[PDB]
Amino acid sequence: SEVAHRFKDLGEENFKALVLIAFAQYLQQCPFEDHVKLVNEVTEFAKTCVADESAENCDKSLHTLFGDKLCTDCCAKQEPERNECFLQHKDDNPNLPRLVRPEVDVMCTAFHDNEETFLKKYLYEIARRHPYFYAPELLFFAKRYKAAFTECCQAADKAACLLPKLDELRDEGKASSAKQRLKCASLQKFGERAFKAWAVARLSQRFPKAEFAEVSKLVTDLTKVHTECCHGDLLECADDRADLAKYICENQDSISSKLKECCEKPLLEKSHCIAEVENDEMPADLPSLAADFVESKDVCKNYAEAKDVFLGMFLYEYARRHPDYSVVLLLRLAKTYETTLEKCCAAADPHECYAKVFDEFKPLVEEPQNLIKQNCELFEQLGEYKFQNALLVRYTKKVPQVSTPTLVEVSRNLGKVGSKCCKHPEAKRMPCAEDYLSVVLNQLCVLHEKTPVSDRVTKCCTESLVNRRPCFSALEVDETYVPKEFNAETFTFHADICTLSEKERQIKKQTALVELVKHKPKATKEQLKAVMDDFAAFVEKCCKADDKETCFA
């Protein structure tokens, strides 16, 4: 039996949580109650299989079981086509209601009146809005979410204790989702081979002292864990994630010094911990890379006898000595290395042909460096809000066909690079910036994939996982774009508009700015400020009031 094996390892609590998440991700539109029913049914059925390893239907596969239940065009089919159906029907932007939170004491009352149905509610909502959310990590946020309500609903003030914590979680939860969406995207659209180079390059940075073989073993287990979680096999994903966490801590000494504090904590915590660990200290005198990848006379021989192992060696060796290069950059270097060998090892005298492969890197290393230097200087010179606005105008012209809400969302997140990275030293800026930029653009890419409207976004998105950022950066203002005429329905007055927060106000104003740019693409930074300021003054006066709606009329 498979259901039992899992129930035993994950324990009932997690098992119920994971199954609930699994369904909420497969059916983002079904009510909360209905899902619980399906869970409990599945949960009981497994307990029998825990007692009777030979009971009825315990020989099934998690997919068939979960499949059948969810079925009480996709269902009219069978395993595995039937599963690939639900996976293929996951929505990255469901038409689901805005997730607002009632009055503090309101939530607090229900957190007590029923603590379980409260958490399942959380997991339910989060899973359904982020159909790819890393299940194991969700269990982490769930416990931290719980901790909040148990400590904050029992204090002098609550909306000063709780809320602040509910803010940080939503944010951290939004980054975790985006971060995991890129991993799923990498596996699916580009294959695991692509994901393996990625994890190899990154773990080698985190763990410079680990010998290549250890990094391989970790990349392997890691690829398995993420494949499962991205494929909807949550129960096994969690189980495998825990085994991996256990392996890491045991061999901790041959991996990284930073794992010490991580390893001493409860399962959920140390897994999250291991995932966020700082790079270990890099070893001192490491032989020059050239010696074995350029000067050696067996380069071409090793490339043929074992390309996969050799290129891996290359990535591993280059990454471990470059914690200052973004993962995507190291992959571009890896790729150039491969291209230069593929051609060189056929020509007359290979050694001469690829003797200058490092020279071809310089160009690829500086392009990222400069861009990061410029927008950090710009950042300081404008502040986050002003900074996002400049990106907003820049990107709106590159891809004017993209819908307003998306452009605002994406631009804002691209704008956060500035505050999130620039406060770091050059040495740590590029990996922070470029790897973060890659996550945001994946958002653009996945949202855009639903209802495509720009072949320029499509090309940059599907052409190469590694060049996306440079691809978007290179884009010139789209001239084939025809000015979007004035609607006005966009600015229909609404009472809320006058009692908004700073966050809210900036968002409307950025929405207004995109519409402005989509309307007059040939505008100047100067005349855009003019139209904005006047319109900002207009809304400010009309909010002064009297018969407001008459004012905005």
Residue set of the binding site for Zn(2+): 63, 231, 233
Select 199 or 399, whichever has its Cβ closest to ligand T44: 199
**Encoded tokens for 58:** 């315990």
Is the bond preceding 405 in cis, omega lying within 30 degrees of 0? no
Give Cα separations from 439 to 44, 93, 122, 399, 453 (angstroms): 40, 17, 25, 18, 21
**Radius of gyration of the chain, Cα coordinates, nearest whole angstrom:** 26
Contact with ligand T44 (CB under 6 A) among 494, 522, 527, 549: 494
Nearer to ligand T44, 47 or 394 (CB): 394
Q: 10 Å Cβ neighbour count for 308?
A: 9
Which lies closer to ligand T44 via its Cβ, residue 306 or residue 536?
A: 536
What CA–CA distance (Å, rounded) separates 146 from 253?
Answer: 34
Task: Round to whole Å and give the CA distance between 207 and 253.
Answer: 11
User: Amino acid identity of 522?
Assistant: K
User: Which lies closer to ligand T44 via its Cβ, residue 294 or residue 471?
Assistant: 471
What is the C-alpha to C-alpha distance for residues 396 and 389, in angstroms, rounded to an integer?
10
Binding residues for (4Z,15Z)-bilirubin IXalpha: 224
Site mask for ligand T44 (CB under 6 A), range 345-374, x = bound: --------------------------x--x
Interacting residue with ligand T44 among 85, 531, 548, 551 (CB under 6 A):
531
Closer residue to ligand T44 (CB): 212 or 491: 491
Among 60, 181, 202, 320, binds ligand T44 (CB under 6 A): 202
The distance of closest approach from Cβ of residue 310 to ligand T44 in the complex, given in angstroms and rounded to an integer, is 22
Task: Select the span of 107-115, 158-166, 404-412, 514-522 touching ligand T44 (CB under 6 A).
Answer: 514-522
234 is an interface residue for ligand T44 by CB under 6 A: no
For residue 235, which of 25, 463, 480 has the smallest C-alpha distance? 25
Q: Per CB under 6 A, does 516 bind ligand T44?
A: yes
Q: How far apart are CA 409 and CA 391, in angstroms?
A: 11
Position 438 contacts ligand T44 (CB under 6 A) = no
Task: Give the C-alpha distances (Å, rounded to integers) separating 205 from 25, 321, 463.
Answer: 33, 7, 26
Contact indicator for 332, 466 with CB cutoff of 8 Å: yes
Q: What is the 3-state secondary structure (H, E, C) of 142-206?
A: HHHHHHHHHHHCCCCCCCCCHHHHHHHHHHHHHHHHHHHHHHHHHHHHHHHHHHHHHHHHHHHHH
- Please report whether residue 187 would count as binding ligand T44 according to CB under 6 A: no
**Residue 222 sits in the site that holds ligand T44 (CB under 6 A):** yes
d(CA 410, CA 394): 12
Minimum distance, C-beta of residue 296 to ligand T44, in the bound complex (Å) = 30
Cα separations in angstroms, 387 against 68, 310, 384, 534: 51, 43, 5, 21
Site string for ligand T44, 71-110 (x = CB under 6 A): ----------------------------------------
Minimum distance, C-beta of residue 428 to ligand T44, in the bound complex (Å):
12
Nearer to ligand T44, 447 or 460 (CB): 460
Using the minimum distance from each CB to ligand T44, give the nearer residue, 60 or 258. Answer: 258
Check if the beta carbon of residue 325 is closer than 8 Å to that of residue 365.
Answer: yes
The runs of H, that is alpha helices, within 321-421 are 327-344, 350-353, 362-398, 404-421
State which of residues 50, 194, 277, 345 lies at the interface with ligand T44 (CB under 6 A). 277
Tell me if 430 contacts ligand T44 by CB under 6 A: no
Residues making contact with ligand T44 (CB under 6 A): 134, 179, 199, 202-203, 206, 222, 241, 244-245, 271, 274-275, 277, 371, 374-375, 378, 390-391, 394, 414, 437, 472-473, 486, 491-494, 497, 505, 508-509, 511-512, 515-516, 519, 531-532, 535-536, 539
